[PDB]
């Protein structure tokens, strides 16, 4: 679902730090969000991403 979605920066051209779940790493990683669009694999903090996604929190 949302947890397997590719990290999408979107069409806008800002640089905002966020987190997404990487299925290969089996954990969360940082990416640069563009400010709009994209998808829900997009979290404000690492902890929150790991909370929603993967493993056995």
């Amino acid at each position: 679902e949302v947890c397997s979605e590719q990290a999408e920066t979107g069409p806008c051209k800002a640089m905002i730090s966020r987190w997404y779940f990487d299925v290969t790493e089996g954990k969360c990683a940082p990416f640069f969000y563009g400010g709009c669009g994209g998808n829900r694999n997009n979290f404000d903090t690492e902890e929150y991403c790991m909370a929603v996604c993967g493993s056995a929190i």
């Binding site: 920066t9 069409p11 806008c12 051209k13 800002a14 640089m15 905002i16 730090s17 640069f32 563009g34 400010g35 709009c36």
Partner: protein
């Protein structure tokens, strides 16, 4: 900026950097006290940096000033990106000198074929990441309305226009948002969005500043 060149250090005294954690957006100095940027670059707290050339090095000319007010266009739409423009009021007036100065607001809309100057600290690669420390420039022409609409079927609103190259290779990129498009001594555009960066048939899309001149004037007077 993808496919551009490094600016002379003096050069663009109107270019500003927006900074929360770090540099995340550009902007344009339109007076002592006001900066124009994009509504999608909105944050609750912002520090404005003026007289920057190399954002990672203290050079002695810069002015750091916190936003006192951050104001998105009331009609900004986050799904369509309509009215992607924002005003920032500085908590103290910038000191206007040789390295920090204003850029005229437009007195006519952009005309197709006009060469413009686009600038910022944006990504310099169409695929991959390489963010510069030094300010980048790009000379690029305003495109026809037909060229803009045919590039983005269904998506160009009245607030938008395109500048750049249909063949690709030159364009603005992530971290350029909010930054200036200048034509013949006047701010015509704000860096907004595009499909990828510098891709074929996907020129950058910019907010048409001329459409907001009255709103800017009125907003400034309302918040003096």
């Amino acid at each position: 900026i993808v496919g551009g060149y490094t600016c002379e250090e003096n050069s663009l005294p109107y270019q500003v950097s927006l900074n929360s954690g770090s540099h995340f957006c550009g902007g344009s100095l339109i007076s002592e006290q006001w900066v124009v940027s994009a509504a999608h670059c909105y944050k609750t707290r912002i520090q404005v940096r003026l007289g920057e050339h190399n954002i990672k090095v203290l050079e002695g000319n810069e002015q750091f000033i916190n936003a006192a007010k951050i104001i998105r266009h009331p009609k900004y739409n986050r799904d369509t990106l309509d009215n992607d423009i924002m005003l920032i009021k500085l908590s103290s007036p910038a000191v206007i000198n040789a390295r920090v100065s204003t850029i005229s607001l437009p007195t006519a809309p952009p005309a197709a074929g006009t060469e413009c100057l686009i600038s910022g600290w944006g990504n310099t690669l169409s695929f991959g990441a390489d963010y510069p420390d030094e300010l980048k420039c790009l000379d690029a022409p305003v495109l026809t309305q037909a060229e803009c609409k045919a590039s983005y079927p269904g998506k160009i609103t009245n607030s938008m226009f395109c500048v750049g190259f249909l063949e690709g290779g030159k364009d603005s990129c992530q971290r350029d948002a909010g930054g200036p498009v200048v034509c013949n001594g006047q701010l015509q555009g704000v860096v907004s969005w595009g499909h990828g960066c510098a891709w074929k048939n996907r020129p950058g899309v910019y907010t048409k500043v001329y459409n907001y001149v009255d709103w800017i004037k009125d907003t400034i007077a309302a918040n003096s």
